[PDB]
Design a protein around this ligand. Structure first.
Ligand SMILES: CCCCCCCC/C=C/CCCCCCCC(=O)O[C@@H](COC(=O)CCCCCCCCCCCCCCC)COP(=O)([O-])OCC[N+](C)(C)C
Ligand SMILES: CCCCCCCC/C=C/CCCCCCCC(=O)O[C@@H](COC(=O)CCCCCCCCCCCCCCC)COP(=O)([O-])OCC[N+](C)(C)C
Ligand SMILES: CCCCCCCC/C=C\CCCCCCCC(=O)O[C@@H](COC(=O)CCCCCCCCCCCCCCC)COP(=O)([O-])OCC[N+](C)(C)C
Ligand SMILES: CCCCCCCC/C=C\CCCCCCCC(=O)O[C@@H](COC(=O)CCCCCCCCCCCCCCC)COP(=O)([O-])OCC[N+](C)(C)C
Ligand SMILES: CCCCCCCC/C=C\CCCCCCCC(=O)O[C@@H](COC(=O)CCCCCCCCCCCCCCC)COP(=O)([O-])OCC[N+](C)(C)C
Ligand SMILES: CCCCCCCC/C=C\CCCCCCCC(=O)O[C@@H](COC(=O)CCCCCCCCCCCCCCC)COP(=O)([O-])OCC[N+](C)(C)C
Ligand SMILES: CC(C)CCC[C@@H](C)[C@H]1CC[C@H]2[C@@H]3CC=C4C[C@@H](O)CC[C@]4(C)[C@H]3CC[C@]12C
Ligand SMILES: CC(C)CCC[C@@H](C)[C@H]1CC[C@H]2[C@@H]3CC=C4C[C@@H](O)CC[C@]4(C)[C@H]3CC[C@]12C
Ligand SMILES: N[C@@H](Cc1c[nH]c2ccccc12)C(=O)O
Ligand SMILES: N[C@@H](Cc1c[nH]c2ccccc12)C(=O)O
Ligand SMILES: *[C@@H]1O[C@H](CO)[C@@H](O)[C@H](O)[C@H]1NC(C)=O
Ligand SMILES: *[C@@H]1O[C@H](CO)[C@@H](O)[C@H](O)[C@H]1NC(C)=O
Ligand SMILES: O=S(=O)(O)Oc1c[nH]c2ccccc12
Ligand SMILES: O=S(=O)(O)Oc1c[nH]c2ccccc12
Lengths: 575, 575
């Protein structure tokens, strides 16, 4: 099935080059004007030769059409609901532009650039026929859905132009002509025509010419994608943001669920293994981020560049953890016990590397800027240090099972002392934000907060250390002392959530602009972890999904540094 | 040995993409400012990743050091002769700048962009160890010769600054520091260092990241090469051009001869087949055009941009026919009788394809511009149609020998009637140029020239048709009637050369600026062809190299259209 062992390097390449593009772009080496030439080259030269070649070589006989109808119907439904509510809710002066552009935003995946390398890694040696579906699903959806949006936007231009229903032919013709002149449709039509005309075989003189342009697309397209995100997120407003929240939730969440349910509803085959693999591939297909061409369309039309560009950037970022978590969630139910144990260990190992590097970057920038010296930033720096110790502890922990038994205990104490400190530090940060905006005079005794933040977890760790019999055969940090450590974590989370929650609601009734959000996102995370803790303790021994629960704790425990890094580290601060 | 059957497709890709870069640039799609961004990506990101990966995997045990030592000594000698004469002849105010850049121009081949794809096509399945030699010879030559040139140019900056031999350390240090900070030297040193440390194996997480950036270099470097040549050739002056003539002959001609002779002198091996292949591979390596990075160095220093940019552009075009002709001449001596026959037929077939398409473009622009209507331009248009028929005739000829015998004769008459006309049209062009610049009154009776240009070859063709017995088993146009056709060609060439030659020398003693040159290059061609004709007729039956002689006629007969297209076709003319 899924060769998920070789999925992480494919996610380290796709976003490693995007990181290189970002670093190069902000380092000011290749400015925006120079970047336009690399965009024109990639978008007008590399992509048409790749599509033309692949369309020439497709063999129209082994394609399972049920998958094709399920995805096209799902995309149509997603387009329909977004357009309907956009027409129903948007303001009268600006309604047709939104109804014409939002449904394209919520349905146009980034399939070639990111989709092809990941599908190839998982599926090249297992079930070779799945790779070819990428070049079939994308063009038909583009052909059938983009012209409608351009029709609506042209209708908006006509309405603002002080007109009527006159020349109903011409709005349709301009939309069709604008769709046809894009360097994608013409070369897809030519490739399909030459597939039948030339009888499925590329001429010898032109194969290498097509391959030279075709192979240069992936790296340069990723690099220009990274270079195009520099500084585009900008400031915002309430209503905009709430729209963005819904649009990204609609795409990433509701598209894959419809795709899987329909695939499960229409395919009727006698092969259970093929049924399972096709359903999983159908789910994984929809998670792909929004295609960068939508922002190009917005720039050319000049009417929603800020919203669409912010949407594409955030959509790209949120998609990275989702593919990993979903992939390992679908491959969990049907395997052995101990290979599952290795699965949880491997996932925790992989996540700790990225969290540690992001934390190191964010902490170094915080330290160098000398901004660590004031009132609120000091507590955040303390929080990040604790998260760093948690990640380092996990890295030291994984290589330990076959080594000195004495080393087990010190690392256990270190891990849960720092994890508890991270929990309490979130509440202390919230309380300090409560105090900072109000409360004149009576400055915060920071020494007291530091003493409480470190002494309390150590005492709790020592209490857990004394009570409990060590289980030497349990290859997991969660069951060294069994029930007693696990019960303590639930109590610790509840105290932190109440302390952090009470202060935050008081602020609303009574740099801030960002700080508050880091508290808000963390509080959402702690609630999810707490429910996982509650389910296991109350329903006997081992719940219906113990592996799923443990995987959730591992993700929310070792990935917090990435969330912190995203807000704080990638900020401009003069050295 | 050399798989030359698959060398033409490799030359249709390398220069096919370069054509796309040229067309796009003049079409104004990607202007000069935008083009700088595509250079920064290729020169600083894709290229450093390609060298670093390959240097890690090299196995320093199977490398034939005799081949390695021969090229480095050969490159040094070419560098030595150019610098010595530059100091002796250059003007005193500008002498140090030229000596620091000219030897670099004549020794820095385009090995990565153009050399590697061609060597792979010929040598991937035959002798796999030849591919690895590209990555050894290129970095060492760059490291040992370029630092010397930057030393000399810096001395000129010091000299013009009114100084002395003071701070001799800093002049040496300035040259060394500038070479090291270039994104080429630093990544070669790191790759060699990590080869021994990590024991020749790339880490799994980083292999795919390097491959994504590495494979994007080949397609994008060629495309950017075409876009940088747009409009750079410029106008010129006398003393400039004569320098350019010598510099290009030094790189392309005298460098490969030294490389082959030394390889024959130092390699002492018992394998004749390996000895033959190694000697042939050494020749083809030096024919590569001047690397585009030299013009980058000229632009940064701002001192010889006009000469060096013109040199690199002209060097690329001349290299294309040279690689093709040289490759098939080394593989001619050692084969069968009848398999050689296909070689002459195949080469003539391949050259006709490129000449026919180029002629169509050049002729079409002339007709549309309505410039065909005046006195001198009219005769050139007559000349180009005649060259077109010769190329058109060869394609019908190759396919017909196994078909209707009657079709043999009509095509035979057609080919030599037009071929003879092409010879005479060259002389008529020269005489008209003689008359145009002088001779007022008494305008040219163009009707007489049109009658003379076509009626005379037809009468000569008819005489050859009657006299001679057809040889049905001779698969070649040159021996249908044996001796009588061959004798006539020599006489026809002599009359044309004398008529064209006499007028041209009269012009010197007594648009022009370009026209004259097309006559001059053609006259050089007819002399070379005539000597080939003379050798065969006077030294019995079949010379020491009959295949070589016949091959020369085929190149100069069907490739004449290519020479004409370069001057006339690639010209700006308002439609
Ligand atoms: C995870 C381990 C496995 C995968 C590893 C694979 C590799 C992973 C590696 C990935 C790194 C990829 C690097 C690409 C380029 C980065 C730089 C960049 O463009 O910065 C942008 C920053 O943009 C933001 O600020 C976005 C913030 C989004 C946070 C979302 C958190 C939700 C996570 C939970 C999701 C659900 C959890 C799952 C639920 C099931 C643009 O910068 P700018 O425009 O200048 O604006 C910033 C500056 N300003 C803020 C001051 C204005
Ligand atoms: C041959 C068949 C097999 C191989 C096939 C492989 C593929 C073959 C395909 C090749 C096509 C390659 C396309 C690259 C881009 C072309 C466009 C371009 O850059 O134009 C440049 C033009 O440059 C010149 O004008 C140079 C003229 C050189 C002529 C040399 C003739 C010698 C040939 C004999 C050699 C020895 C013979 C052999 C002896 C043994 C730049 O243009 P510009 O800067 O605007 O300047 C022009 C305008 N202006 C003039 C008005 C100012
Ligand atoms: C339940 C959610 C369903 C429905 C509830 C929708 C309420 C949205 C309210 C937003 C703010 C508002 O009042 O409108 C503002 C924005 O104008 C719009 O709302 C138009 C934007 C497109 C419509 C919503 C797109 C999301 C579709 C749904 C995605 C479904 C997936 C989500 C479900 C998991 C008014 O703009 P102004 O400038 O003030 O004038
Ligand atoms: C294998 C694991 C991979 C994990 C990947 C995903 C996790 C990593 C993700 C994120 C962590 C890193 C984020 C950096 C992006 C921000 C850049 C930035 O702000 O620009 C700065 C400049 O730019 C520099 O100074 C460039 C620094 C390059 C070093 C990067 C090291 C980390 C790269 C990864 C290697 C890891 C090790 C891999 C091998 C062991 C600041 O710019 P400014 O203040 O706007 O002004 C510019 C100053 N100037 C104009 C004077 C020039
Ligand atoms: C397989 C054999 C391959 C052989 C390859 C090597 C031999 C062929 C080599 C050379 C022959 C062709 C040389 C053309 C280069 C000059 C272009 C030029 O000057 O630009 C012109 C514009 O540009 C155009 O209008 C673009 C025309 C594109 C069509 C090209 C067809 C030939 C390509 C090959 C396909 C062959 C068929 C292959 C398949 C059977 C003029 O520009 P301007 O006057 O400066 O102003 C611009 C006008 N504007 C600003 C209003 C826009
Ligand atoms: C026999 C040929 C050997 C030698 C005869 C060389 C005579 C060259 C005369 C050029 C014109 C002249 O007078 O100098 C002008 C240019 O200045 C130079 O000549 C300097 C340019 C570099 C030196 C020559 C490079 C060719 C090297 C040799 C290549 C060998 C390969 C070719 C042989 C097959 C003066 O410039 P100004 O602005 O008037 O001041
Ligand atoms: C869970 C799966 C199915 C869907 C993903 C939905 C959630 C996790 C996504 C959708 C919209 C996202 C938000 C969109 C916009 C921003 C603003 C940015 O400056 C910080 C991140 C933040 C606040 C994102 C956090 C994560 C987010 C809430
Ligand atoms: C014969 C092999 C080994 C070496 C190649 C040397 C000859 C063929 C080369 C070297 C220098 C070349 C010339 C250099 C510059 C120009 C100016 C350009 O506007 C037209 C072509 C023209 C006039 C070239 C014609 C071909 C040329 C004479
Ligand atoms: N414009 C702010 C909105 C915001 C930040 N923090 C908040 C807390 C509550 C409500 C809104 C916000 C943003 O996108 O970051
Ligand atoms: N500058 C001219 C020189 C030139 C053209 N034709 C000539 C004939 C003879 C002597 C010099 C020339 C050129 O490069 O094209
Ligand atoms: C999928 O195809 C068939 C069932 O349709 C069956 O051979 C098996 O389940 C799978 N085979 C391959 C080769 O994937
Ligand atoms: C070249 O290598 C040796 C001679 O050095 C001999 O086996 C033969 O000539 C060639 N072999 C191969 C494998 O190329
Ligand atoms: O089908 S698309 O995903 O839109 O392909 C693309 C079109 N334009 C692009 C620019 C950067 C990366 C990918 C691009
Ligand atoms: O080693 S080089 O040949 O100089 O590689 C290169 C460096 N810079 C380049 C720009 C275009 C094409 C090739 C290039």
């Amino acid at each position: 099935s899924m060769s998920i062992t070789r999925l992480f390097p494919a996610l380290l390449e796709c976003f490693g080059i995007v990181l290189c593009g970002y670093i190069a772009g902000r380092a000011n080496v290749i400015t925006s004007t120079q970047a336009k030439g690399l965009g024109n080259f990639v978008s007008r030269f590399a992509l048409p030769a790749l599509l033309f070649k692949n369309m020439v070589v497709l063999n129209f006989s082994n394609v399972d059409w049920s998958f094709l109808y399920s995805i096209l119907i799902a995309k149509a439904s997603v387009f329909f609901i977004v357009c309907v509510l956009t027409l129903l809710v948007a303001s009268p002066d600006s309604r047709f532009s939104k109804a014409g552009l939002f449904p394209i935003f919520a349905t146009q995946s980034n399939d070639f650039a990111l989709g092809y390398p990941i599908v190839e890694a998982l599926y090249q040696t297992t079930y070779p026929e799945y790779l070819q579906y990428i070049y079939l699903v994308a063009p038909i959806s583009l052909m059938m859905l983009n012209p409608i949006g351009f029709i609506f936007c042209e209708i908006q231009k006509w309405k603002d132009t002080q007109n009527a229903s006159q020349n109903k032919i011409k709005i349709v013709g301009l939309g069709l002509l604008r769709v046809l002149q894009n360097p994608i449709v013409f070369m897809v039509f030519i490739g399909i025509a030459f597939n039948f005309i030339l009888d499925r075989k590329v001429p010898v003189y032109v194969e290498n010419f097509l391959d030279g342009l075709g192979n240069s697309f992936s790296g340069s397209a990723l690099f220009y994608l990274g270079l195009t995100m520099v500084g585009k997120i900008k400031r915002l407003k309430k209503s905009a943001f709430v729209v963005l929240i819904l649009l990204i939730t609609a795409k990433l969440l509701v598209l894959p669920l419809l795709c899987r349910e329909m695939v499960e509803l229409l395919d009727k085959g006698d092969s259970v293994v093929n049924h399972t693999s096709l359903s999983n591939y159908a789910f994984l297909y929809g998670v792909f981020p929004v295609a960068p061409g939508v922002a190009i369309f917005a720039t050319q039309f000049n009417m929603e560049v800020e919203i669409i560009t912010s949407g594409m950037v955030i959509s790209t970022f949120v998609s990275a953890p989702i593919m990993y978590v979903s992939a390992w969630l679908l491959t969990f139910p049907t395997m052995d016990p101990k290979p599952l144990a290795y699965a949880i260990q491997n996932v925790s190992f992989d996540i700790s590397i990225v969290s540690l590097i992001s934390l190191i970057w964010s902490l170094a920038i915080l330290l160098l800027s000398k901004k660590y010296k004031q009132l609120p930033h000091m507590l955040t720096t303390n929080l990040l240090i604790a998260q760093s110790i948690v990640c380092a502890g996990m890295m030291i922990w994984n290589f330990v099972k076959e080594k000195n038994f004495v080393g087990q205990i010190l690392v256990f104490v270190l891990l849960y002392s720092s994890l508890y400190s991270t929990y309490l530090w979130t509440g202390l940060l919230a309380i300090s934000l409560f105090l900072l905006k109000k409360r004149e005079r009576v400055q915060i005794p920071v020494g007291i907060i530091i003493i409480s933040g470190w002494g309390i977890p150590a005492l709790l760790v020592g209490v857990l250390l004394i009570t409990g019999k060590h289980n030497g055969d349990s290859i997991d940090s969660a069951f060294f002392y069994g029930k007693e450590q696990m019960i303590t974590t639930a109590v610790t989370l509840f105290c932190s959530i109440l302390i952090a929650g009470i202060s935050l609601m008081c602020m609303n009734q009574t740099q801030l602009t960002r700080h508050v959000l880091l508290c808000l996102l963390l509080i959402i995370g702690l609630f999810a972890n707490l429910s996982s803790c509650l389910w296991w303790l109350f329903n006997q021994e081992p719940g219906r999904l113990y592996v799923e629960l443990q995987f959730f704790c591992a993700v929310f425990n070792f990935g917090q540094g990435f969330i912190s890094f995203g807000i704080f580290g990638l900020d401009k601060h003069l050295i």
